[PDB]
Design an enzyme around this catalytic site. Structure first.
Site, short mmCIF file in Angstrom:
data_model
loop_
_atom_site.label_atom_id
_atom_site.label_comp_id
_atom_site.label_asym_id
_atom_site.label_seq_id
_atom_site.Cartn_x
_atom_site.Cartn_y
_atom_site.Cartn_z
N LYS A 80 -45.92 -111.47 22.46
CA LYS A 80 -44.94 -111.24 23.51
C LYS A 80 -44.22 -112.54 23.87
CE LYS A 80 -45.73 -106.70 24.35
NZ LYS A 80 -44.77 -105.55 24.55
N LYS A 129 -46.54 -102.95 13.35
CA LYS A 129 -46.85 -101.87 14.28
C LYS A 129 -45.56 -101.25 14.80
CE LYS A 129 -48.29 -102.47 18.69
NZ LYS A 129 -47.40 -101.51 19.44
N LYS A 142 -42.72 -99.56 21.07
CA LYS A 142 -41.94 -98.72 21.97
C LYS A 142 -40.72 -99.45 22.51
CE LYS A 142 -44.94 -99.53 26.07
NZ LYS A 142 -43.99 -100.30 26.94
N1 LIG Z 1 -47.91 -98.12 16.98
C1 LIG Z 1 -48.97 -97.70 17.69
N2 LIG Z 1 -49.87 -96.89 17.07
C2 LIG Z 1 -50.93 -96.46 17.77
N3 LIG Z 1 -51.25 -96.71 19.05
C3 LIG Z 1 -50.34 -97.50 19.62
C4 LIG Z 1 -49.21 -98.04 19.04
N4 LIG Z 1 -48.51 -98.82 19.94
C5 LIG Z 1 -49.22 -98.75 21.04
N5 LIG Z 1 -50.34 -97.96 20.92
C6 LIG Z 1 -51.29 -97.59 21.97
O1 LIG Z 1 -50.59 -96.87 22.97
C7 LIG Z 1 -51.27 -97.05 24.24
C8 LIG Z 1 -50.26 -97.41 25.30
O2 LIG Z 1 -49.61 -98.65 24.94
P1 LIG Z 1 -48.85 -99.53 26.05
O3 LIG Z 1 -48.13 -100.61 25.34
O4 LIG Z 1 -48.11 -98.64 26.97
O5 LIG Z 1 -50.09 -100.04 26.97
C9 LIG Z 1 -51.00 -100.98 26.60
O6 LIG Z 1 -50.88 -101.57 25.56
C10 LIG Z 1 -52.16 -101.17 27.56
N6 LIG Z 1 -52.34 -102.63 27.79
C11 LIG Z 1 -51.97 -100.44 28.89
C12 LIG Z 1 -53.15 -100.57 29.80
C13 LIG Z 1 -53.21 -101.27 30.97
N7 LIG Z 1 -54.47 -101.20 31.50
C14 LIG Z 1 -55.26 -100.44 30.67
C15 LIG Z 1 -56.61 -100.11 30.75
C16 LIG Z 1 -57.17 -99.35 29.73
C17 LIG Z 1 -56.40 -98.94 28.65
C18 LIG Z 1 -55.05 -99.27 28.57
C19 LIG Z 1 -54.46 -100.03 29.58
C20 LIG Z 1 -52.37 -98.09 24.00
O7 LIG Z 1 -53.64 -97.46 23.87
C21 LIG Z 1 -51.94 -98.77 22.69
O8 LIG Z 1 -53.05 -99.26 21.93
#
Ligand SMILES: Nc1ncnc2c1ncn2[C@@H]1O[C@H](COP(=O)(O)OC(=O)[C@@H](N)Cc2c[nH]c3ccccc23)[C@@H](O)[C@H]1O
Ligand SMILES: CC(=O)NCc1cc(Oc2ccc(-n3c(=O)n(C4CCNCC4)c4ncnc(N)c43)cc2)c(O)cc1F
Ligand SMILES: O=c1[nH]c2cc(Cl)ccc2o1
Lengths: 333, 323
Positions: free
Chosen positions: A112, A194, A197
């Site tokens: 990031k 990867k 989003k």
């Molecule tokens: N290309 C991909 N293929 C498969 N899985 C993917 C891909 N891109 C993203 N992910 C998964 O999507 C979830 C949400 O991602 P975020 O970026 O919103 O969000 C995140 O990356 C977290 N930090 C948000 C968060 C904040 N506190 C937490 C506590 C527990 C679990 C999660 C969270 C995630 O599970 C992420 O692994």
């Protein structure tokens, strides 16, 4: 009482098929088996600079998308992170039990930072501590995430163990729940990266709220390989694009890769891309139809947010009080 | 009235330097300013320490601030952790603080040690604070808080007041065995300091060892360059009794340093005995202390919640749906 599931997703960017397969899909399937708690982590989202109107809309978009995926507010707790102050309170306290080096080594912070050199902020650096607080507040047993969040979950385990070793059984030690298929869905034009989003190149992504016809065009243009003859076979090293397509297909249909490989014997990438686009177009059409019924019902979204914050607060306040007693604060009246 | 924010650290007994050099003057400024006194237990935990001593020291600090004359009806006094808004604003302000700003203030220091300047900034900005009486070692922290407030304001409108240092100082209390150094509550050499809870026998002993000079004959005259120890004893005596340095120099004409030390100890302990009586009265009254904390936190949260709401609105968070 059932074991507890907690997971969250950011109201920033536009959630992709990657977010769905790595996380949301598992969220939906665990709602009866476990006591599930799902969070829209708007405090994490602002570690990347957001437009204020975009952030508000995206929080509500994300809530409605949870509902459209099948997250059921009568079964699971659904809430917005900033509605529960205990997240920030425990996040500060856990800073004091987290080491600087544990944060500086983090892959997400490094990735990031390289993308946003103009906004390398302390929230981006401190991101894993707030995430550990998110999880530990709820006595969480299982955290369903994609592979990219493994390193963060592992730190939250190290924090729980470090704190418990000084203070007693204050936290449960959480375990990751990462799927066998679709844990790391890859970009369509760059299958070694990867799927994001927030990609600057939309042709890399399949957005959950994207026009299905647009998605089907993107699927056909996904890069494959030069194999002669073309062969539908799983090999991430030499056939990244074909493998990623098989992964998406397996994750949508529930079929194994071996099964898919046998189904595509004697066929080439047209058959492969035709079935991928068929299955994904159908999923997104049905998803989006449910989505608008939820997204345009502000009274229902308001109610879900209110009940969810109330449920979460009851759990979070209990954990925080035990944390504050252990570290030695005078308890609030 | 301008809003003043002071953070009182639980750990570390206050010294006569802390009392005569600042608190005593702030006690007589409670009608001039809206003073906020925050017992910052959340800052304390950046350093690992015994839990039960932290609880005791939080209550010790509250009772001593009361004993020094902080009036909980005039000023707002409360425990930091009792007001969730501090941590809430701290997280948000993290996202508007450059990592490089914290690094310019290794792998084994805890993240709270690295990140507490942002919590400090949240503590101040929460209360629309005008004035902050920082120590010299906290000037960079204040200046960061100003930078964060201006950065946020430039993006979102005039959400925060830009705080100013409290410039004016004001009695000079130096270390007893090293008179060129100010008396500091955090000094490991306890013989340099006189704590507010010290008994008359402890005060006598520490004053008797206070360094003086080899002047012959001994002369009780003010001269910081050449007679630092005697000058410090004179400053302490004047700060206690209100007598001028010239008047005391006249009073001790033809007298030796033993005479001066005898009066210093007597004067200091006279001042401390009224403070100590009030301290133990307040400290041993659990209900009074519990009421002070409950009232103070209610007053603080009422103001803090107004600021946080504006901050959350500016950022764009969906507002909470209260039950
Ligand atoms: N290309 C991909 N293929 C498969 N899985 C993917 C891909 N891109 C993203 N992910 C998964 O999507 C979830 C949400 O991602 P975020 O970026 O919103 O969000 C995140 O990356 C977290 N930090 C948000 C968060 C904040 N506190 C937490 C506590 C527990 C679990 C999660 C969270 C995630 O599970 C992420 O692994
Ligand atoms: C004297 C006074 O009132 N100052 C204004 C003021 C004080 C506040 O309280 C604190 C308490 C502690 C710190 N702080 C702090 O100042 N330091 C060091 C001490 C040595 N000199 C360099 C700075 C800290 N080191 C570790 N952890 C901390 N939390 C540290 C920093 C601030 C506070 O939270 C807000 C505030 F406006
Ligand atoms: O995880 C975190 N880090 C934090 C830093 C501040 Cl200043 C406040 C809350 C926090 O939660």
């Amino acid at each position: 009482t059932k074991p507890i599931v907690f997971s969250g997703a950011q109201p920033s960017g536009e959630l992709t098929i990657g977010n769905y397969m790595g996380a949301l899909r598992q969220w939906v399937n665990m709602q009866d088996d476990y006591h599930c708690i799902y969070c829209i982590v708007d405090q994490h989202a602002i570690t990347v600079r957001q437009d204020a109107q975009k952030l508000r809309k995206a929080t509500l978009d994300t809530l409605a998308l949870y509902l459209a995926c099948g997250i059921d507010p009568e079964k699971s707790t659904i809430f917005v992170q900033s509605h529960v102050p205990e997240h920030a309170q425990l996040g500060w306290a856990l800073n004091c039990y987290t080491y600087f080096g544990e944060l500086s080594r983090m892959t997400q912070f490094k990735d990031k930072s390289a993308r946003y050199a103009e906004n390398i902020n302390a929230g981006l650096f401190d991101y894993p501590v707030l995430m550990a607080a998110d999880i530990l507040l709820y006595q969480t047993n299982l955290v369903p995430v994609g592979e990219d969040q493994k390193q963060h979950l592992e730190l939250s385990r190290d924090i729980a163990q470090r704190f418990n070793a000084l203070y007693g059984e204050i936290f449960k030690v959480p375990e990751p729940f990462i799927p066998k298929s679709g844990a790391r869905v890859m970009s369509l034009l760059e299958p070694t990266k990867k799927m994001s989003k927030s990609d600057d190149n939309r042709n890399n992504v399949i957005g959950l709220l994207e026009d299905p016809k647009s998605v089907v065009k993107k699927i056909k243009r996904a890069v494959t390989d030069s194999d002669e003859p073309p062969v539908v076979r799983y090999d991430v090293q030499n056939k990244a694009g074909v493998s990623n397509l098989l992964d998406i297909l397996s994750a949508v249909t529930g079929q194994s890769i071996p099964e898919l490989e046998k189904q595509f014997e004697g066929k080439m990438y047209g058959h492969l891309k035709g079935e991928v686009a068929d299955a994904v177009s159908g999923m997104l059409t049905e998803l989006q139809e449910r989505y608008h019924r939820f997204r345009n019902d502000e009274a229902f979204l308001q109610q879900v947010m209110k009940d969810g914050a109330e449920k979460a607060s009851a759990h979070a306040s209990r954990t925080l009080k035990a944390v504050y007693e252990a570290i030695g604060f005078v308890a609030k009246r």
